[PDB]
Scaffold this motif. Structure first.
Motif, PDB file in Angstrom:
ATOM      1  N   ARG A  60      26.847 -30.711 -27.294  1.00  0.00           N
ATOM      2  CA  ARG A  60      28.157 -30.806 -27.728  1.00  0.00           C
ATOM      3  C   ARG A  60      28.376 -31.823 -28.828  1.00  0.00           C
ATOM      4  N   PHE A  61      28.242 -33.106 -28.468  1.00  0.00           N
ATOM      5  CA  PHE A  61      28.438 -34.258 -29.308  1.00  0.00           C
ATOM      6  C   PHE A  61      27.466 -33.953 -30.488  1.00  0.00           C
ATOM      7  N   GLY A  74      23.045 -30.428 -18.844  1.00  0.00           N
ATOM      8  CA  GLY A  74      22.899 -30.727 -19.890  1.00  0.00           C
ATOM      9  C   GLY A  74      23.694 -30.176 -21.143  1.00  0.00           C
ATOM     10  N   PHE A  75      24.937 -30.233 -21.141  1.00  0.00           N
ATOM     11  CA  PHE A  75      25.764 -29.662 -22.284  1.00  0.00           C
ATOM     12  C   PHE A  75      26.379 -30.710 -23.308  1.00  0.00           C
TER      13      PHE A  75
END
Length: 11
Positions: A6-7, A1-2
């Motif tokens: 980031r978004f 879950g990265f």
């Protein structure tokens, strides 16, 4: 879950 992280950080 990265991707989601980031978004949120980019926006």
């Amino acid at each position: 879950g990265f991707i989601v992280k980031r978004f949120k950080i980019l926006v």
